[PDB]
Design a protein around this nucleic acid. Sequence first.
RNA 1: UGAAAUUUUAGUACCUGUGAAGAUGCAGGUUACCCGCGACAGGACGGAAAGACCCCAUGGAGCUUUACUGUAGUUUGAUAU
RNA 2: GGUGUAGUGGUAGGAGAGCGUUCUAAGGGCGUUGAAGGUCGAUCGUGAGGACGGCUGGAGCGCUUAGAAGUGAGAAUGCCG
RNA 3: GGUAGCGGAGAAAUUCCAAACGAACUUGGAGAUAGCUGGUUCUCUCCGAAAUAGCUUUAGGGCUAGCCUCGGAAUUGAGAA
RNA 4: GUAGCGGCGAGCGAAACGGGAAGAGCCCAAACCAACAAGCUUGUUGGGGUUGUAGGACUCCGAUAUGGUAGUCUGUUAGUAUAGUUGAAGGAUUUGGAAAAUUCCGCUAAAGAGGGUGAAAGCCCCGUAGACGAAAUGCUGACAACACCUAGGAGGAUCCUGAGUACGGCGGAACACGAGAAAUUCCGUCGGAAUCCGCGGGGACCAUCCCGCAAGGCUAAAUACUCCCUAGUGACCGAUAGUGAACCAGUACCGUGAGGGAAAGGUGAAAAGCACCCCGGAAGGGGAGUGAAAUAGAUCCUGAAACCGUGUGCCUACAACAAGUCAAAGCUCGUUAAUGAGUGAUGGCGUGCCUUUUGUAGAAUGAACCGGCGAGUUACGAUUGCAUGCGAGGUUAAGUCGAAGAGACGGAGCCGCAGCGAAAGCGAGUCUGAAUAGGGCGAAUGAGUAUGUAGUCGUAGACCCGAAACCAUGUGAUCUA
Lengths: 50, 146, 64
Amino acid sequence: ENGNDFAALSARNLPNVSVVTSDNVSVLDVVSANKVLATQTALTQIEEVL
Amino acid sequence: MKLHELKPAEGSRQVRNRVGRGTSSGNGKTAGRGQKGQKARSGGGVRLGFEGGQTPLFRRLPKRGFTNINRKDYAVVNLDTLNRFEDGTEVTPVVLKEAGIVKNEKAGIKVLADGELTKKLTVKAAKFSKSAQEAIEAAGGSIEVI
Amino acid sequence: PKQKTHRGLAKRVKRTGGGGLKRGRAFTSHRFHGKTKKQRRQLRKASMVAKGDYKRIRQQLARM
RNA sequence: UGAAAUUUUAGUACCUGUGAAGAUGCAGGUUACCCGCGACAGGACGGAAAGACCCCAUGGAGCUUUACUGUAGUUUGAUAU
RNA sequence: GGUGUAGUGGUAGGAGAGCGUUCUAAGGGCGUUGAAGGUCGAUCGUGAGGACGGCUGGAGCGCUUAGAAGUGAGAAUGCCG
RNA sequence: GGUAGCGGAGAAAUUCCAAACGAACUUGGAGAUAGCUGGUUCUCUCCGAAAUAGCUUUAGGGCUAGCCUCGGAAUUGAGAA
RNA sequence: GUAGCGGCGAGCGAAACGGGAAGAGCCCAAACCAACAAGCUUGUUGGGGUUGUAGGACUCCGAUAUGGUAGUCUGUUAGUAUAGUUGAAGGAUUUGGAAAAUUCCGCUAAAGAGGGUGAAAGCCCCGUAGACGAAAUGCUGACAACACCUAGGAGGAUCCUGAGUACGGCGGAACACGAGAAAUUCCGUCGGAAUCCGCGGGGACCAUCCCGCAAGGCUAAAUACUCCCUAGUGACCGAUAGUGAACCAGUACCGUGAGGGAAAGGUGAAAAGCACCCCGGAAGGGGAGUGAAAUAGAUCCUGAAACCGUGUGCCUACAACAAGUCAAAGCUCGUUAAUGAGUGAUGGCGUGCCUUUUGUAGAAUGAACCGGCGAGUUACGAUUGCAUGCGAGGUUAAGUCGAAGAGACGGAGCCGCAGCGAAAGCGAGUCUGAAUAGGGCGAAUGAGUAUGUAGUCGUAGACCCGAAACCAUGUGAUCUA
Ligand SMILES: [K+]
Ligand SMILES: [K+]
Ligand SMILES: [K+]
Ligand SMILES: [K+]
Ligand SMILES: [K+]
Ligand SMILES: [K+]
Ligand SMILES: [K+]
Ligand SMILES: [K+]
Ligand SMILES: [K+]
Ligand SMILES: [K+]
Ligand SMILES: [K+]
Ligand SMILES: [K+]
Ligand SMILES: [K+]
Ligand SMILES: [K+]
Ligand SMILES: [K+]
Ligand SMILES: [K+]
Ligand SMILES: [K+]
Ligand SMILES: [K+]
Ligand SMILES: [K+]
Ligand SMILES: [K+]
Ligand SMILES: [K+]
Ligand SMILES: [K+]
Ligand SMILES: [K+]
Ligand SMILES: [K+]
Ligand SMILES: [K+]
Ligand SMILES: [K+]
Ligand SMILES: [K+]
Ligand SMILES: [K+]
Ligand SMILES: [K+]
Ligand SMILES: [Mg+2]
Ligand SMILES: [Mg+2]
Ligand SMILES: [Mg+2]
Ligand SMILES: [Mg+2]
Ligand SMILES: [Mg+2]
Ligand SMILES: [Mg+2]
Ligand SMILES: [Mg+2]
Ligand SMILES: [Mg+2]
Ligand SMILES: [Mg+2]
Ligand SMILES: [Mg+2]
Ligand SMILES: [Mg+2]
Ligand SMILES: [Mg+2]
Ligand SMILES: [Mg+2]
Ligand SMILES: [Mg+2]
Ligand SMILES: [Mg+2]
Ligand SMILES: [Mg+2]
Ligand SMILES: [Mg+2]
Ligand SMILES: [Mg+2]
Ligand SMILES: [Mg+2]
Ligand SMILES: [Mg+2]
Ligand SMILES: [Mg+2]
Ligand SMILES: [Mg+2]
Ligand SMILES: [Mg+2]
Ligand SMILES: [Mg+2]
Ligand SMILES: [Mg+2]
Ligand SMILES: [Mg+2]
Ligand SMILES: [Mg+2]
Ligand SMILES: [Mg+2]
Ligand SMILES: [Mg+2]
Ligand SMILES: [Mg+2]
Ligand SMILES: [Mg+2]
Ligand SMILES: [Mg+2]
Ligand SMILES: [Mg+2]
Ligand SMILES: [Mg+2]
Ligand SMILES: [Mg+2]
Ligand SMILES: [Mg+2]
Ligand SMILES: [Mg+2]
Ligand SMILES: [Mg+2]
Ligand SMILES: [Mg+2]
Ligand SMILES: [Mg+2]
Ligand SMILES: [Mg+2]
């Protein structure tokens, strides 16, 4: 979800991790990723967006 | 899908045909243009409708008519489309635009009697055909010329 | 750029409901003493662009 | 000491015939051991120059005139100064 | 997949299906225990073409799926060497 | 030293104007235009012409039709012998 | 690509409305007032005033405020540009000349961007994430200061409101509009107004109506462009490519001059660039050395083909040969081990490739050979096929936010759902017609649309190369007249 800066920063540098905000998610990102780790608030915001 | 296993739908994409790439391809050498002539030249060919000097068809035919400056066209609506509304509903150009039936009303809505109306309605429009007015009123509705 | 319309044709033909082109008739300008009344009566009526002519010119009226 | 034009690859004969109708190369026959050197110029429709002759292109250019259309100049009138 | 019958010369040209080249993405790999490239070989496929060995070489390159093209030369009195 | 290309100069030859002057040279418009000539690069499979009519400042060009190819619709099956 | 313009040809081609980006409005001239000066007006100065629901002067009243600015090398302040500082984490084992590679255990990460290092490094180096930093000089923004603008109401008796102007004739030109029925705008020439009961415009012109107030000026933002500077990006080039120019390139060279205009990158990790010896006058070699490698020795990575030469397994001096192919003895050799390979006496058949042609072995054209380079592309539109989504519906464009992304919003607009008629107009009909007739085009009898992709077409150089030429700037009388 927006504003989770510490989570975003701490995760980004991992080679296998791609960080995206729930508001900015694209077909290419989802398809590239083998698994999707989402927070519950992020899922709520996604459901609202779609 | 997986980026390493993509597959387009069958027949969705085709391979471009490249000419002048050897004889066995069927477009080698002449590249399908044939042998000499005007149509075989780069940028060759005659302008559209040209007839090699025979008087073209449009020249043979006479001009006709004129355009009325005050021309008025009406967005047409038929009784079958009016059936989509409920009895007692007030049909209005705004109602039609909101319903998406008439995106562009032009000079105004004119109602025509193509189909069979079945609902009682009060219809407001720029114009009504005589048959359309009769059908609306016979269905127990009413018509008002906005 | 946008493909341009042939203005001469646009003045001389009309697009019909079925996609065809309605056209006037030739020989309807003058020298009527050289034509029988039957010819004049039957040239007064409009006609349609023939298949061959249409296939030559359709691209000039695409957006008429 | 050391070029050049040319050059599809060539183990590159003669006669008669054939063939896009004038063949070293195709047919029949004849002649001819292999490689050169000095000479000649019949042929390779030899080389050189996308024939200048001829015709064609709704090509070009220079020129002519009572070709067409313009026009610099020259002249005549009105008008302003 | 099997059987049967029929068919399969071809210029202009239409249709179809493929080979190979460079690059991008993803996946999965290979490389100083020798990549690409070069060279030789008596190898495989119906074709464009694909492997595998020996030698040379010395650092990058395949494969599968999809994508994009400066994507294939033997001729232009083509240009450069 | 002077005369400069819509030009100069010419005891006059279309003669000279930096080794080609019926209009210098250089750059630009400019990749002028070329119904004309040449060239146009991998493979296999299916089918496969035309060199005719009509009209054309048209005749070695072009347009429609005829002949080829690919897809589709439909029929009281209309084609061929 | 509509309305239109157009030898009504070829073509040319709007504007308003609507949706957005950005937004900002202000000064004079004149009337009139005060002063000044000369010669009751007439010039200078200051005030005054600025306009169309007419304004202003002028006359009455009342307020001496209220707000604003597109000003200032005026400071004060902040930020920023131009140097910088800091910045985590690895050792072993195998191959190797060299480890970053391999293998085993670790560690770091707000840093796994990137580059370099003796081969391919998150942890070796420069860096990166992040944190921090400016004496001096610019730039920006704020704050303040100074500065400059900033009045309401009521009356019209009178005065002012842009003159050789607007406008007209003639001749041109600009408006998509080529004189056309032609408005509107402008130029030259001539003629030549009104002024608020006024004037201009609403595409000849007139009347009515509506809208506006010319002949004076200024004005930021959205917009166009990049020689340069800084930081980056690329399904862009990789030494015949990419700038002409990766290299001392606009150089060499060419030309009187304008001007034209090249070629030319790579030793190795490190010069460790071969001490010394030998042949030779040297050049150049052979040893000896360096090096992992010298057939990496400076013409230096790799090192193809043409071309040239050395060695030889087979064949060749009675043969007429598009040079091969088919058959084949002999000899030689033994492979991706295949009913093998090289050569080949001898015999059969057999006139190259390409282009262009009715027809070419052609004595028709092109190629000396080898290598490289060298020709249907892209953008915007049209149309068809195929594919996907939605479906009587389909869809957004510009623009805003966002990584130069996707995506979201944006429905203005476009296509389709109704046609017929020249048009008024009518409408599942409509037009022709006197017609309930006939007939035409339509409906009955419905699929479209957005996007992708491919075929073809149009506009563009439009598949590539090629004129003689035309036009517009320049450079040339050092030859020659
Ligand atoms: K074709
Ligand atoms: K007509
Ligand atoms: K006539
Ligand atoms: K011949
Ligand atoms: K001779
Ligand atoms: K000449
Ligand atoms: K090999
Ligand atoms: K060549
Ligand atoms: K002379
Ligand atoms: K348009
Ligand atoms: K014309
Ligand atoms: K004032
Ligand atoms: K190091
Ligand atoms: K590194
Ligand atoms: K500063
Ligand atoms: K006019
Ligand atoms: K108006
Ligand atoms: K107005
Ligand atoms: K080497
Ligand atoms: K030999
Ligand atoms: K033989
Ligand atoms: K000849
Ligand atoms: K009727
Ligand atoms: K009818
Ligand atoms: K569809
Ligand atoms: K399409
Ligand atoms: K082009
Ligand atoms: K094209
Ligand atoms: K002289
Ligand atoms: Mg494509
Ligand atoms: Mg063919
Ligand atoms: Mg060829
Ligand atoms: Mg040809
Ligand atoms: Mg042809
Ligand atoms: Mg008439
Ligand atoms: Mg007759
Ligand atoms: Mg004969
Ligand atoms: Mg003979
Ligand atoms: Mg022979
Ligand atoms: Mg010969
Ligand atoms: Mg000759
Ligand atoms: Mg000739
Ligand atoms: Mg057969
Ligand atoms: Mg490569
Ligand atoms: Mg190419
Ligand atoms: Mg060559
Ligand atoms: Mg003479
Ligand atoms: Mg001379
Ligand atoms: Mg031009
Ligand atoms: Mg056949
Ligand atoms: Mg004619
Ligand atoms: Mg021909
Ligand atoms: Mg560090
Ligand atoms: Mg390690
Ligand atoms: Mg004009
Ligand atoms: Mg005038
Ligand atoms: Mg006027
Ligand atoms: Mg008004
Ligand atoms: Mg501005
Ligand atoms: Mg270069
Ligand atoms: Mg190279
Ligand atoms: Mg160059
Ligand atoms: Mg070597
Ligand atoms: Mg070398
Ligand atoms: Mg004998
Ligand atoms: Mg013998
Ligand atoms: Mg002939
Ligand atoms: Mg030749
Ligand atoms: Mg001079
Ligand atoms: Mg001189």
